[PDB]
Amino acid sequence: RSVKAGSAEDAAFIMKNASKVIIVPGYGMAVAQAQHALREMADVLKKEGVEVSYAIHPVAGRMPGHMNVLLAEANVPYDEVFELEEINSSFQTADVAFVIGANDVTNPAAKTDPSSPIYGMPILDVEKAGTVLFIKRSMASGYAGVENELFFRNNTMMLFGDAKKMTEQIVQAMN
Ligand SMILES: NC(=O)c1ccc[n+]([C@@H]2O[C@H](COP(=O)([O-])OP(=O)(O)OC[C@H]3O[C@@H](n4cnc5c(N)ncnc54)[C@H](OP(=O)(O)O)[C@@H]3O)[C@@H](O)[C@H]2O)c1
Numbered sequence: 001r002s003v004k005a006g007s008a009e010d011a012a013f014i015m016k017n018a019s020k021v022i023i024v025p026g027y028g029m030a031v032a033q034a035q036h037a038l039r040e041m042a043d044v045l046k047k048e049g050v051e052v053s054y055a056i057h058p059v060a061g062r063m064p065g066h067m068n069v070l071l072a073e074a075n076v077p078y079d080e081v082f083e084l085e086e087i088n089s090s091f092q093t094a095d096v097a098f099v100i101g102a103n104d105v106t107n108p109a110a111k112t113d114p115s116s117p118i119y120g121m122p123i124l125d126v127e128k129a130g131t132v133l134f135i136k137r138s139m140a141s142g143y144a145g146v147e148n149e150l151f152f153r154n155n156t157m158m159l160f161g162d163a164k165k166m167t168e169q170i171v172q173a174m175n
Contacts, residue, residue: 010131011166014097014130018131019049021098022126024098026060026105030070033163035073035074037168038167041171052080053082053087053090085122087125096129096156102134103141103142107123107148128156132156132157134148136163137161
């Protein structure tokens with residue numbers, strides 16, 4: 001087994017109702033729907049009084065300064081957005097981590113065990129937050145998709161489905 005239960009229905013808590021998280025725009029996120037989903041989410045939801053930064057290497061997806069496009073091109077802000085080495089703060093208070101579409105960018109293997117097929121680095125210690133929403137089908141390859149057992153601790157994880165189903169059910173249609 002792993003360590004989760006409700007899919008996006010859970011986001012509503014770590015997303016549309018989680019004092020402190022970090023939208024981690026991975027490959028799907030912006031190219032999934034998050035781009036405009038986490039966009040309205042980071043707004044209609046940040047207004048509730050919840051924080052939302054972005055936990056991802058400054059390259060989690062296609063180009064480098066691109067995942068910030070879904071944040072900018074959509075509407076979400078990048079001032080509360082931390083690339084990588086500075087994520088030590090985002091996840092320092094985030095009692096969650098909406099890890100949307102990321103995959104090898106969060107490979108906590110470096111945080112858990114270097115045995116991984118790669119070497120990892122200062123990823124975005126996402127599992128090291130309250131909950132975590134790794135939204136994607138399942139066999140997410142990415143640049144590595146290796147060691148990522150992060151989905152085995154306190155309700156922190158991945159929510160099978162498309163990043164478009166992520167914010168659509170939580171911030172766009174919980175119940
Ligand atoms: N950006 C650059 O210029 C650059 C340059 C050199 C190295 N890198 C490195 O490349 C890595 C990138 O990490 P990352 O997490 O962003 O990358 P990935 O691991 O490259 O991420 C791809 C992930 O997004 C998902 N995905 C793809 N299409 C999707 C879709 N249509 N809808 C929903 N999900 C989709 C995939 O899983 P699912 O199919 O399960 O969704 C996949 O696992 C980093 O280690 C980085 O340092 C980047």
